[PDB]
Amino acid sequence: KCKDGLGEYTCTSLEGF
Amino acid sequence: PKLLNKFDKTIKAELDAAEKLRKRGKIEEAVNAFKELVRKYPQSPRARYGKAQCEDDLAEKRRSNEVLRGAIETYQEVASLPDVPADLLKLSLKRRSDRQQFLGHMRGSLLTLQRLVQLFPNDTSLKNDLGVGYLLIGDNDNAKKVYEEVLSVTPNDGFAKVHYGFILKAQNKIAESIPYLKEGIESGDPGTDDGRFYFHLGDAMQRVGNKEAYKWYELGHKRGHFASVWQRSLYNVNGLKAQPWWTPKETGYTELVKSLERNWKLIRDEGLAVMDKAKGLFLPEDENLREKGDWSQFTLWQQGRRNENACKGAPKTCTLLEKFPETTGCRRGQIKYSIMHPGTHVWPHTGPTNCRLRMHLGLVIPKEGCKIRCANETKTWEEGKVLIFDDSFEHEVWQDASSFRLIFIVDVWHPELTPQQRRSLPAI
């Protein structure tokens, strides 16, 4: 997860519509 | 695209008729036309693909996960038919993978992508997409092995270069990542003009000392990736007031600030009790943001969710904070204690979103050696006082005191966010 920084390829999760 | 096999060529008239309805927006009509084509011609791959494309369009129209799940199955059915043209085969499984990812079936997308690579071992682009699959589930090791295969066959692939450099940088091979990121962005290949690769290239240069990092931040600002050279968050909402330092009155959260400052010793004492009697609850910082030193965090809320076991250790603080949904409900922020020891230096960095403001409440502040820069201004903490900054701007921290420094971090929604956005924004 991206808490203090921006280290992940994506910071959100996908859950459809 | 060559989509019609031998048999489908003999029925192009019926297939083209059905597709025209889809292009005309008669989605419910086209599904029934393609359904009847699949019933009449159960082995036709074009008819089966048409049914999936129609189920796909219908899933968008209704915003239905169940309908999309059915389209995902029909896309696979196309690949199980006999004599499917290779172009139709790629398109049907690539789209299946995409929609599986859109639903969060990341493990299912990976299986589809692996099948594509087994079916077409010479397609570089499918390997590149498999590497993205591994990155989406966080498997940087397998992602790295994929892009190494690509860079062996096509060594000038810009997409492979940036993603290889991203993985290196994430594995803390800072110096080694730089040529892969710079050469990918400059290749101009599709997929290389992405803020993520500008972000990490400039950060990698900043860490190693190269003063040209600013130029890459500026180029990312010119190409619409960063709101400025200084504010480089990537999950943004446009228009929000943008300034590095805020006063309590400017935020409008004056009740929260007053509560924090009136009750600061209680917050301090519960944090010290955890340091003394439950030190294991403080977890080391895990985002590779430190050059050197010791920095640990004890989190009470994350993504708008209360940590029940953590609040057992600071129960009065958690009771106090429950009155302020502007921070407990901030799904793009945290509430946490943060301890830093002498000899710590945090690299310049930004947070991921402009949708939050970050409050710091000083709890135990050594009288010398602790400071925080944000943009072009450096400030210090005061015990029992709140500092507010926008951590989407570049900021940097030093701890060169003779004892520990403890603060309380309270993230709030950016005040200009509407209530509608506060409930719909994906959590971060």
Ligand SMILES: O=C(O)CCC(=O)C(=O)O
């Ligand atoms: O000083 C601290 O405890 C953390 C500094 C920081 O980078 C932040 O609060 O985002």
Ligand SMILES: [Fe+3]
């Ligand atoms: Fe930070």
